[PDB]
Write an enzyme that holds these catalytic residues in place. Structure first.
Site, PDB file in Angstrom:
ATOM      1  N   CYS A   1      -3.879   9.247   3.474  1.00 50.82           N
ATOM      2  CA  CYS A   1      -4.321   8.017   4.118  1.00 50.82           C
ATOM      3  C   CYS A   1      -3.131   7.181   4.575  1.00 50.82           C
ATOM      4  CB  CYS A   1      -5.206   7.197   3.183  1.00 50.82           C
ATOM      5  SG  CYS A   1      -5.902   5.718   3.959  1.00 50.82           S
TER       6      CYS A   1
ATOM      7  N   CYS B   1      -3.479   3.540   3.905  1.00 49.64           N
ATOM      8  CA  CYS B   1      -3.490   3.366   2.455  1.00 49.64           C
ATOM      9  C   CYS B   1      -2.084   3.113   1.929  1.00 49.64           C
ATOM     10  CB  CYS B   1      -4.094   4.590   1.764  1.00 49.64           C
ATOM     11  SG  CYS B   1      -5.842   4.862   2.117  1.00 49.64           S
TER      12      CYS B   1
END
Lengths: 133, 194, 194, 133, 194, 133
Positions: free
Chosen positions: F31, F34
């Site tokens: 991600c 993320c």
């Protein structure tokens, strides 16, 4: 000394366009009772510093001002406030009568927009009999 | 500026009772032309504002003693656009009515002593109309100032002012404030236009 | 001295709510023979004085906690010249009624605890009539003193007095004051003559 | 010691025309329970200084006073306040029962004109069950 | 639990005026669907709560200056179970309505600025019904908490909150509190059962 | 460091049965966004000590938790309070956007019985235009 001596020429600036209240004395050399108040005005001019200016206009040397405000007799005191005639006192009077006159009319302005200024102090007292009954 | 109407409300005045600087009791709305404000205890009289039955948790001994001397108090009445006050009490009452003071050329904040037995016109509608007319010409700020001209303050027994130990009305133990609804309504019709 | 009439006003009593030493909310005027004062929130009931909906800007956590325990509160009712109080709350109520205290020969300032489920006559018109008769004979100053005999103070949940941490009624978080209009009117008919 | 010993002659001045509250004890040399309270009265007379005066009247040596107030049994305590009989307590009792009696009746006056004096302190408490139910 | 009725009281709300942390004037009981709260001086209008005629002995210069700017104030009206506020004043008004905040997913204590000319639904009866239903399930303590959800606070001219010098509503010179009687009555029918 | 690293097994104890509020980050190593918030979470975890706990759950190593709460995309932040899901924030965001999210939802409880806790502080402000009009 703190007393302005007005003329017909200087009356516009010294009185009408003046800051605060101005006490204008109309007098002459032949006015008996005018000489009575003359020492009183000096005491007033010194005790009411910062809140009142004492001004004298000799009507002999300056004959133009008095009739414009309808001054027909002397001594005559006009209390001026921001260009207007606030209060008027006529005839000879004592130092006490002059203080009572001043204390009651140093309201400031120019009301009604400054009417609140008259309730931000300690109110004066009258009896119902003071209406004279 | 649209001309207002000199109409009268159902309740010609409202009275609020104070002790020192504290509101005490509810406001009394006068619907009767003639009424009294006294120190007695009738709770159900439209013609009487009885101060004697009113409780005040923070009341001191002084205030209680002065309340005892209110007695028959003041009679207030409304006739032909004029409001009067009559001192029924055995002690004097002291009135601060700017509209009354104006009538005599007094300082507008003047407190006037009304001794027992004496009658005094404390308001005249026409004097107020005159003042209201001067205000419209002087602008909006002058008109807002006229609100207090619709109010009258009255002290029982104890005087206040430059001649008394009590300098302000909130230093008196027993006083009332009157709102005259007629002038207030007239003032309102002007205020909402300006 | 002209004999007075034992007539009853339309509103038999007035109730004012307090928190500590501060008035909270408006006065409630009882027009119904039977009513309650409770901690709930009905605003439009002539038979209920609901304290739960009343705001107080200066309310503390303590007062709020005590308000939560008022519950069904007290039922007050008026029968045959007598006033009664019934503790509906799950907590006790504490009553200071000089007229009640007189009936039992108690100190007139006595605070009496009424636990849940219990009923107590807190006023009797005739006892007051008796006291009023003694006052007329003792003079005017004695008659003025009878005003507080027309009042009753009542505290919810928390007691006050010599046996409690709270020594005075203004130290309790939730209390009411009752003015009994009948006795006040009777008292007035005497006061205005003396 | 601070206990007045009354006689029939001195009863008028020492009790009826006395300042403040006076506790009058009616006792005799043959009254058993009267001797029980005798030491208690001394403790009361010293602890209630300035607010109460303890007085004793022997009814044997002074037989005139007791019947006038309807005293038919002893011990009997009459609490006098400004000439009047304020409260009365009959029979033998403990120091605690005497204090409870005194505390509840040292109201002062002479009411109703001084009824306010009864609400300028800390109120006493009762339960509804104290009516005995 | 017995289902309550979504009935409406004669007076749909009560308004109490404050200056800083002090109650000023009496409570106004709205019987009209549409009304205003303004800074003018009409005393006898069921559709107008005029704050201009209200006296306050402890009023400062600041408060007086702010009162001067209330002007036409706020128009409050009640339509189909919904309450609205319209800013008629030339200055903004600030509203704290938890029921309104809920509708937008805002913090329930949120103070929302309504500038001149703007209209805002400040209460919806159904949102409150939804919350009341969640409370019944969560227990009695949750239901007591709903009282303040029946109240709305509104400040004239001056804002308060995290973005202003004034952190709390009692630091604003001119504010009102609204009690919505309908929700209070509904709340009461629940409270007295639980 | 003050960041709890959750697993599917330890999620029950560390989050649901935890004292106070827990911020649960759903992330994975792939991600992108993320990783953008990863340093921000550290700053949050240290600045919000005592009132918030920051917890991270890697959904690759722990695939059971995310679907149970309907987490279908990452980054996804669930704010847990006493076992319940209080608030949720989805997608990448700045440190400021994260603070605004936290400040508005650290209400505590678990209401309505603790609704009073939301009025014992300084209220936040909105404009009517913040409704977006």
């Amino acid at each position: 000394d703190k007393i302005i001596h007005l003329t017909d020429d200087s009356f516009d600036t010294d009185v009408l366009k003046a800051d605060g209240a101005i006490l204008v004395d109309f007098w002459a050399e032949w006015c008996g009772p005018c000489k009575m108040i003359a020492p009183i005005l000096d005491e007033i001019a010194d005790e009411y510093q910062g809140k009142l200016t004492v001004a004298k206009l000799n009507i002999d040397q300056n004959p133009g001002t008095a009739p414009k405000y309808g001054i027909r007799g002397i001594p005559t005191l006009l209390l001026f406030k921001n260009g207007e005639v606030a209060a008027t006192k006529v005839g000879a009077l004592s130092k006490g009568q002059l203080k009572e006159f001043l204390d009651a009319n140093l309201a400031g302005s120019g009301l009604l927009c400054d009417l609140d200024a008259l309730f931000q102090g300690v109110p004066p007292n009258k009896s119902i009999y003071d209406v004279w009954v | 500026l649209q001309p207002v109407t000199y109409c009268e409300p159902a309740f010609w005045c409202s009275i609020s009772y104070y002790e020192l600087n504290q509101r005490v009791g509810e406001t009394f709305h006068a619907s009767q032309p003639s009424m009294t404000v006294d120190g007695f205890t009738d709770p159900s009289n439209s013609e009487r504002f009885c101060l004697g039955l009113l409780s005040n948790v923070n009341r001191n001994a002084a205030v209680e003693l002065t309340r005892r001397h209110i007695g028959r108090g003041v009679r207030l009445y409304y006739i032909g656009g004029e409001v009067f006050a009559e001192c029924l009490s055995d002690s004097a009452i002291f009135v601060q009515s700017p509209n009354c003071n104006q009538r005599y050329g007094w300082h507008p904040a003047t407190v006037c002593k009304i001794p027992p037995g004496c009658n005094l016109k404390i308001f005249n509608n026409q004097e107020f109309a005159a003042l209201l007319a001067q205000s419209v010409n002087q602008g909006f700020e002058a008109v807002y100032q006229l609100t207090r001209m619709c109010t009258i303050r009255m002290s029982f027994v104890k005087g206040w002012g430059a001649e008394y130990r009590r300098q302000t009305v909130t230093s008196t133990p027993c006083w009332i404030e009157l709102h005259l609804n007629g002038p207030l309504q007239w003032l309102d019709k002007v205020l909402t236009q300006m």
